[PDB]
Structures are given as C-alpha cells and as structure tokens.
Design a protein around this nucleic acid. Sequence first.
DNA 1: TCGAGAATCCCGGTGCCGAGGCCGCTCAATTGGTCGTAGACAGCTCTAGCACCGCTTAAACGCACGTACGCGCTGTCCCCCGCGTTTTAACCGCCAAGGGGATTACTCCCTAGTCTCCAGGCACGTGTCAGATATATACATCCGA
DNA 2: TCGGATGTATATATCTGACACGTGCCTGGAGACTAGGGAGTAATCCCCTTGGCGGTTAAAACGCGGGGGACAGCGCGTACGTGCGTTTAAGCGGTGCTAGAGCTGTCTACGACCAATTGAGCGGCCTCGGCACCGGGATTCTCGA
Lengths: 96, 97, 94, 93, 78, 78, 107, 107
Amino acid sequence: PHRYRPGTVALREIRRYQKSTELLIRKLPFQRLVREIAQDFKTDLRFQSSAVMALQEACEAYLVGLFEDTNLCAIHAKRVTIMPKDIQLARRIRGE
Amino acid sequence: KPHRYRPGTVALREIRRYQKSTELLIRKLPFQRLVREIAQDFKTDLRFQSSAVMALQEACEAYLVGLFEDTNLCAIHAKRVTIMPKDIQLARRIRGE
Amino acid sequence: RSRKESYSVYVYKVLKQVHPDTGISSKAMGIMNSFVNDIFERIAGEASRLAHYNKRSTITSREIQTAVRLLLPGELAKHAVSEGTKAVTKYTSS
Amino acid sequence: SRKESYSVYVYKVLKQVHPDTGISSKAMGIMNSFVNDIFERIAGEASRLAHYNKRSTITSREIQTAVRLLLPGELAKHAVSEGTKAVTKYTSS
Amino acid sequence: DNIQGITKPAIRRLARRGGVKRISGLIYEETRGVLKVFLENVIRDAVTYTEHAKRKTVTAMDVVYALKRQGRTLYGFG
Amino acid sequence: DNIQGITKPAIRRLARRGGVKRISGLIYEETRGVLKVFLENVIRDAVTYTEHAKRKTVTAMDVVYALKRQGRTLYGFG
Amino acid sequence: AKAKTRSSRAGLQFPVGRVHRLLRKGNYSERVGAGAPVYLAAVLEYLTAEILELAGNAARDNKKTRIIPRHLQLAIRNDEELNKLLGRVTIAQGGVLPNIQAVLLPK
Amino acid sequence: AKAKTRSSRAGLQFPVGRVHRLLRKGNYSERVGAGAPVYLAAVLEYLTAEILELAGNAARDNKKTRIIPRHLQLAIRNDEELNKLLGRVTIAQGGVLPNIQAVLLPK
DNA sequence: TCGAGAATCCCGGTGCCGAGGCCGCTCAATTGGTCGTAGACAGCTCTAGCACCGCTTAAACGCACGTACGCGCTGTCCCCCGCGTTTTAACCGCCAAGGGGATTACTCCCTAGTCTCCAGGCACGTGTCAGATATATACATCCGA
DNA sequence: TCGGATGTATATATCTGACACGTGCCTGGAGACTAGGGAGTAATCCCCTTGGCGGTTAAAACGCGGGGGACAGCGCGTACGTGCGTTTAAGCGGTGCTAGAGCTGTCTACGACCAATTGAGCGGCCTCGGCACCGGGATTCTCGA
C-alpha cells in the first residue's frame, strides 16, 4: 500500500513551483475575468493581448507576495496552515 | 495597603488618556542631542534649526506609533496581549523594511 | 524684503463661506497651506505626465480632469469633476 | 515608425563585461524598461532639486545629489565615482 | 459566475509558489475577493487612462503605467 | 551612546499612544534599534539635501523633503 | 478698461491667477491651457471646503470655535475617503483617533 | 568638421547625446547643463553593467549562455543593494527566489 | 450586589497672547493686442483583436480514507505592573555672541538657438545554433516492512 | 532500521525558431558662431542658533509584592492532504472580418510674448476675545467582601 505521507507532496510542489517561472493562473478564465471587470467601466471595450498578459503577471506577482506574507504570519502564530484571518491581518499591516 | 489597582486598569486609563491627547511624548532635549550625535558623523559640525528638530521628532513619533499599532495588532493575532520583539520584526518585514 | 507666498486668505475665505464663524490657529493654517500645496503638486505632476503621454504639450481641462479621477477616491473624484466642469463652463460663459 | 530605445547600448555594455553571454528579447525589454525607469527617477529627482532650490538649470551637481539620494550606499558611492570620472575625462577634451 | 473561474487549484498553485505548506478551505473566497478588488482598481486606472486618449483598446503601455502610478511598477512591457 | 536619550517610560508612553496594553522587556532594545535606523536614513537624506544647497544649517523644509522622498509626507512645516 | 479678476469671473474663491503662474513656471509642460488653472483651482477649493467643513464640525463637537491640528487630523481620519486620499501623510500635532481592541478590554 | 561623438569623447558606451535630448525635451527644467547628460549616461552605464554582470553570473552557474528574465530577477533579488533599489519593481516572466521556512520543513 | 476610595467631566473666575481686522504699499495679475504653431478634424491604410470551429489532452471535480494538527484545556513559573521612594536633568527664563542665511550688484561665460553637415542608429532581411523535447540511465530520497 | 519504488538529475540525438549580424537609409546628433540672461563671486546685515548659568520641579530610576499571562504538555475530533476515476474546457491550429490604432495633410483657433496699469495681496500694528490654567465639587468608575 504505497502512499506518500501528508506534507511531502506539498514540499515537492513548493520546490518545483519556486524553481519554475511559468504562468500559473489559466490564461482564458483570467482574460474573461478581466473583460467582465472592465465591462462595467466602459461599453464594448477592447484589450490588447500584451495588456492582458501584463495584468496577469502583475496580479500573480501580487498574489505570490501576499501569500508569502500570510505564510509568514501563519508560521508566526505557531501553525503551518493559512486561514483568511492571516491574509486579512497581512493586508491590514501592508496598508491596503 | 488596601485598594491597589489590578494590572490592566491603569494601563487602560493611560492608553485612553494618551490617545485622547496629542502632546509631545519623547523628551525634547534627549531627542535633539540624539539627532545631533547621529548627524555629526555625516558632516562635521553642521547646525540644526529648531523647527527642523521639531519636524524630525514629529515624524519620528508618528512612525513609531504607527509601528507600535501594527505590532500590537500582530501580537493580538498570535493569541497574546503583550508585544514581543518578534512582533515588531515581523511587522517591519511585512511593511517592507 | 520678504515676499512669502501662501494660500492663507483664500482658505480663510472658503472657511468663512462654509462656516460663518470658526477660527483657524496658525498651526492649522500652515497645515491647510501644506495640504493645498501637496494636492496641487500631485495633480499638476499627474497632468504633466498625462501631457507627456500623448506627445502633447498643453495642460488643458481634460488633463486635470483625468488626473483628478486618478488621484481621488470615488465619491470625492465625482464631486471634484462636477465642480471643476461647472467652474470651467461658468468661466467660458463670460 | 522609428521607435527608439536603449537596445544596442545594453548589448554593447554586456559584450564589454561578458564576452559571449547573450540577451534574450524578453531580457532586452526588461533591461530597456529598467534603464528608462532609473533615468526617469534620477531626472525627476534632479528636476525637483533644481526647481526647489530657486535654480533653473540641471547640472552635474544636481544629478550627483539625485544619485546620492536615490541609490543605496555602495551603489551610490560607485556611481558617484564613475560619473565624476566620466565628467572629468569629458571636460579634459 | 466568472470570478469563480480562478479556481481552487490555481489558487493553491499560486500559494505554493508563494511558499506555504498547508492551505485551509476558507481562504479561496478571501483570495478571490482580494483578486477582484485589486483588479478592479488597476483596470479602472487603465480604463480611465485609455478614456483620456480617446481610445477603445486598453494598450499594455497604459496598463503598466497605471500599475506604476499605483505604486507597483512592472518591467518587461516598455 | 546617547541612544538611551529616549527612555523606558518614554517608549512606554509612545506604545500606549500606539494602542498596546502590555509591554515586554527586549521591546525597548528593539524599538531603540528601529528608531536609530529610521532616523539615520532620514538624517542622511536631509544632510545630503542641505549639503547640495551649499549650506551648513539643516532647515526644517529640507527635513520635509527628506521625509517626502521616503514616501512619508509631513504637514505643518512648509 | 475694467479689472475684473479671473477668480470672480469663474465664480471661485481660490486664486486662479496664482495657480496659473505656478503651473506655467512649474515646468509641468511647455504650455498651459486657459481652462486648466480654473479646473485646478475649482478642484482645490472643493477639497479644501470639504476638509474644512469636516474640521469645523469636529471643532464644534469639541465645544471650540478655533480649528486646531487635532481637529483637522480627526476630521481627516474619521471620514473614510479623505483618509484614503491622505493615508500616507503624518499630520503635525496629529494625535491618532482613540481606538482600543476588543480583546484588550477588561472583562 | 571632425565628427567626434560625445559618447566616445567621454569614454562611455551609453548615448550621452540621446540622454541630453531626453533631458531637454522631457519637461524637467527650462535649461540643462552640459555635464548633466554625461553624468547621467555614466550612472546608467554603471548600473546596467552591475546588473548585467550579476545576471551573467546567474546564467553561467545555471549552465546557460543566454540571459533570460528569470536570471535577471535572480541576480536582482540575490544582491542586497539592487533589491533595495528595485523594491517595488515586478519583473515580468520572472519567478521568485526559492525559499522554505524552517518550521514548514519536515523534522 | 453593596459599601468606600480614586479619577474625571463640568462649572466659574481670571488672565494672556494670538487671531482677526485695519492700514499702506507694491508688484504681479489683467487688458489689449500680435503672431506662430498644436492639434482638431477629415481621409486613408492595414496591423491586429475578435468570433468561430473542431481536436487533444492537460487540468479541474468529486469522493474516499487517513491522520496532523488547530484548538481547547490545564498546570506551572515568571515577569511586567502598580506603587512608593529616591535621584536627575528637562525645561523655563535670561544673557552673549557671532555663523552664516538671506539679500543685492556686477561681470563672466554657459547654454539656448540657428545653420549646416554627416554617420550612428534603426527597420529589414537572413544564416545558424542554444536550447527545448524525448528516451534511456543512474542517483536522492521516502515511507514501510 | 534496509529496501522497493517513486521522482529527479544527467547524456545524447534533433530540430526549430529566435538571436546575432550585414545593409541601406535618414533623421537626429555634432561643429561652429552668436547673444543674452543665469549664476559665481564679493560685500553686508541682522536672525537666530549655539553656548552657558540658575532653579525647580516633573519625570526617570530603583526596588518590592504579586497576580495575571506566556508557554509547555496533553487530548480530541475535524478539516485538509493525497490519490484515482470522471468530467470539463483550456489550449492548440487555422480562418475570416472588420473596428480601430496609426499615419498624413491642413488651417484655424489657441496660447505664448510684450507694453501699461491698477488693484489684489502681503508686511506690520493693534486690539479684544477664545482659550489655558486653577479652585470646587458632582459624577463615574474600580475594588474588596
């Protein structure tokens, strides 16, 4: 009955995803999300492909930074898991 | 001696009083001496205006009270009431400094 | 020999316009002057950047309007835009 | 559409510091954007210093002060030395 | 209906890149809300930048600008 | 030395204004350290500002510039 | 013939001439439009009127007829939008608004 | 006419003439000194040389002879002064320097 | 909940200096005109974004199982708090002085501006090799037997 | 714990599209000269910043009793990690169409420049009213039993 103990697969994923530099959020759903968000600001707006790529890159970098900060908060609170209070305090300290 | 205040009540009165007011907390002369001593190693015998030291101390106090505030929030998040140096160093790390 | 420049008379006029009788201390006067200067500098810098962004050389009404919509929160931006447009059209009506 | 950018200069300085290392197109764009951003930052600081000192010109002193304000310690020292050397050698001609 | 399109595995992958071992199940709603707020702000800035230029296409240049004006600049796009 | 100029009661009052009930022991050394580093940065910027203008007295308005450069504006001084 | 000031022409109180001169001599751009100083002065006047109305309300709350930096600081922070606009400035004689956390309260 | 480029006159690699043109056209001040573009070109060249040497090292120890944005971000973040200078900068197509907190690691 | 003890809002009275109004002076904003050009507008091109259509397969979903641990609870020990008592140096007031910040004048000379000339850099085109993929092999390592 | 199996680092073939380099051209940089206002330099003043002395008192420093809190240990039941089968739709590659960005020509209204001027705004003085400060005492908390 081969089975990896919890945590090891998480560590492998963490190392593999920190070593890599590719784009994580799927492109098409993010493009649709951006189009919907911009739809209520202007009628029938158009978007350049490079603009959507820049939006995705900036948003992913911001999320990675926020998750790193909230992981710091979690390991500060004597635990290894993150819950919404952690990211809430991280945002509040960051000055959102 | 009867009627000794339990810890926390005096602290609560002090915190309410100092939040209500807006006077100067850091003593003027020690801060001015400190800033002169820390600036004398950047340029020899340079002079400081009184309003310059006043503005510097005001910015000092504002930054320090903001930090504390944030570190008190962080300490509260850790199921603690008292701030610890871990809290300030983590708050500084999150603030990017 | 001194010709220091400040927004004291104008902020006092607007204060007496909104509140019939309210004093402003010297510290509050300097604070309001600094706030006015900071907001003006921010809006002017944003308008300058916006003029440089389309190879244009004129700071016009649209530049400051977009700068206001950029640097101000929602309700504040809407109210400031309405007030600025009203002032501009009143001036041009003369 | 004669778009202009710091394209050949970054490559030249790279081939000067490293003989065979190449730069990809994305790396070229990143380096060009970084050069543009740093130049704009230093120019803005110099302009603020010159205008807010009741002066009307940007000289070597203004940019030296701007680069001492912007860059961190060791980078500021080395950049100031390099700029002074370049200005002195240019004036010597 | 579409904000959900940023699904749970994508959030988990982003967090793993961020450097966190375990993830709770209540964080996905919060991170989707954070995503929506941040994208609303940045896209509003980009949209008004385009509206100033009498354009209908949000170019990448104005988006990166708007990010820079937000206080979080970005390279690799000019 | 001269870093003990700010004292234990003074830091206690600063923290009480900041909104914290109880205070540890090493907290004073940590706050003195962070205060020293922040004041060193601001004083370096202000001293360079007053050095550029061929002056040997630091006016308050330089200090205002030094604070503004570090992304912390100050009001009531010019 | 006639010296009708431009500030009264626009129906304002802030100096449109002074902001025009500042824009022109502030090297923001090569040239400045005619309506640009009027728009900028109107925006500045509205912002100042809003912040001063809030400060005066706060002062009247504290049974004082003189606006002081404490009242301005309180009026800025209590209102959410002006707090967001001025969220990075440190007002002299600030005295941050009272705030005690729920857990810290005795029980 | 001798036709001696000013960039080669100062012994630099960056275009001092183009920097001077950008300084003049860019609304910074009504007049720009002669040594200012030389100083700016020297500063830009030194910064680019430092960052490119670091990125070249990060490429060489990665068994690759071509710099990619990942190598540039690794060079920027690994150094201390550059990280302080480029603090708010987000590098497109770059990743993140690998790190794992001590607590999260297994026993 | 019911007692005394302390801490604070409220009120009245007195003084004080800072804000508000007034005065005179000036310099900068307004009138009016002239003139060069920035861009508003119309017209055209044509790169590029959008919608569709189908195929493939990576990725997300749902569910079952286990177990790591987040949280609650309790015990301990310690360590800041409150408070009383001693010490010290901050602060206020006053007095001297001279460093240099701010101002004005003058002359040098640095740089904007223009004309002319030419070559450095850019758009375009083409070779070619650095590296991305795939297969096979050997090492790191993980979790049990 | 050694050991089976999983994942990952390493060598080799290969084929591809992006990078490095050559080429023509033109627009922007450079050589040279002018002229005009910025500022470097020189005095001069008086503002204020440094320095020092006396007191006086608030606040810092020290020390002790102790109760509340930080932290470690332990139990538990749940929420999340991990893996497998199913479902989904993202990503791939073409293909067509046109809304709209980019470029070009023009001519006109709009903003810079400039002489004159006059009144809006600033420097300085004066005054009284809003506010700081002290004494009384009623309310509002806090603590022990």
